[PDB]
Enzyme design. Structure first.
Site: not given
Ligand SMILES: *[C@@H]1O[C@H](CO)[C@@H](O[C@@H]2O[C@H](CO)[C@@H](O)[C@H](O)[C@H]2NC(C)=O)[C@H](O)[C@H]1NC(C)=O
Ligand SMILES: CCCCCCCCO[C@@H]1O[C@H](CO)[C@@H](O)[C@H](O)[C@H]1O
Length: 317
Positions: A105, A187, A224
């Site tokens: 991330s 995502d 994610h």
């Protein structure tokens, strides 16, 4: 791309050192280290304890991580200072040898921002393995910014932010070191990610950009957190770390690796923790700092985002 000397740190070196930790070893004397940079709303252990810490250890590395306070929610420019400091320390601590950097991330944005504005680490990073990186930020954060429920780093990770604009204008959307970007079109946190092209937020020019669906088909779904913990991700990550080119090789994986469940080498305990990876991050965001404007760019980045607006006003060189 910026060159010359590195900008000065805004934080004391002792403060930056306190955010660095290695498993079973001191940064000043560590064998084959790998730097792990956490995602938004988490510490190093919260992001990787159930996945890449035990996995990297099995690959023969000594896992090290940074945990910028509070839970990666503060200014991305400051979070980057922790990484730049860690790379310098680990490089020398490993006998002046290059070391791989693995992120998740925001950790990817932090790594690329550091390589763009801090030239010295460019010869110290062996390669970059980024899972679900948001180089262009995410369009989903917009509504949260308007309601003033966004932490400093959430403002900066919003598409169109002064920070993402500065990275792009400085040439940061092209790979600087051998980079592999593994992401998913499905995502739920980072978008756009569906075009399997430069339009995607995880895409870097000249990099090994691997959208999971382009390899496993349109029925393959990982989120994610899955982009980091899935068996597919492990195979791609192991490929990138073992490669002689510094990037993952297509010949190392195939359709039989398209497993959306947590890495097989993880213990049952670790597999359950990995499945609920986003839980701690969501709690940190709900209880963490929130503001009504994007943090000001530091002096070295201001020339690349003229005209944008931050907490103090319109940006100027
Ligand atoms: C969070 O980020 C902010 C903004 O970068 C940091 O605040 C700055 O800290 C430096 C060093 O102490 C000061 O010289 C600046 O004046 C501060 N600027 C602002 C706008 O506050 C802060 O130190 C960071 N906090 C943590 C815990 O990382
Ligand atoms: C009866 C039908 C059962 C379908 C089981 C599908 C399992 C895939 O579920 C997977 O779980 C992972 C761990 O939470 C996630 O990271 C992935 O995004 C998700 O696709």
């Amino acid at each position: 791309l910026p060159s010359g000397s590195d900008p000065a740190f805004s934080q004391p070196k002792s403060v930056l050192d306190a955010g660095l930790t290695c498993q079973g070893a001191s940064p000043s004397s560590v064998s084959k280290p790998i730097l792990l940079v956490p995602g938004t709303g988490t510490t190093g252990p919260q992001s990787f304890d159930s996945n890449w810490i035990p996995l990297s250890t099995q690959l023969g590395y000594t896992p090290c991580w940074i945990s910028p306070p509070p839970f990666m929610l503060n200014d991305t420019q400051v979070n980057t200072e922790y990484m730049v400091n860690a790379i310098t320390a680990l490089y020398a601590g490993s006998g002046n040898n290059k070391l791989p950097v693995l992120t998740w991330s925001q950790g990817g944005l932090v790594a690329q921002w550091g390589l763009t504005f801090f030239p010295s680490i460019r010869s110290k990073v062996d390669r970059l393995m980024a899972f679900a990186p948001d180089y262009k930020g995410t369009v989903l954060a917009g509504p949260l910014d308007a309601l003033a429920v966004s932490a400093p780093s959430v403002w900066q990770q919003t598409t169109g932010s002064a920070l993402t604009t500065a990275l792009r204008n400085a040439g940061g959307l092209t790979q600087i070191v051998p980079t592999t970007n593994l992401y998913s079109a499905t995502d739920e946190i980072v978008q756009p990610q569906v075009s399997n092209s430069p339009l995607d937020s995880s895409y870097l020019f000249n990099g090994k950009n691997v959208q999971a669906q382009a390899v496993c088909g349109p029925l393959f779904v990982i989120d994610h957190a899955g982009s980091l913990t899935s068996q597919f991700s492990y195979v791609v990550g192991r490929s990138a770390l073992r490669s002689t080119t510094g990037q993952a090789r297509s010949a190392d994986y195939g359709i039989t690796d398209c497993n959306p469940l947590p890495a097989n080498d993880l213990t049952p305990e670790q597999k359950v923790a990995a499945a609920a990876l986003l839980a701690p991050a969501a709690a940190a965001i709900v209880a963490g700092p929130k503001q009504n404007c994007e943090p000001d760019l530091m002096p070295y980045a201001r020339p690349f985002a003229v005209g944008k607006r931050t907490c103090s006003g319109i940006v100027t060189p």
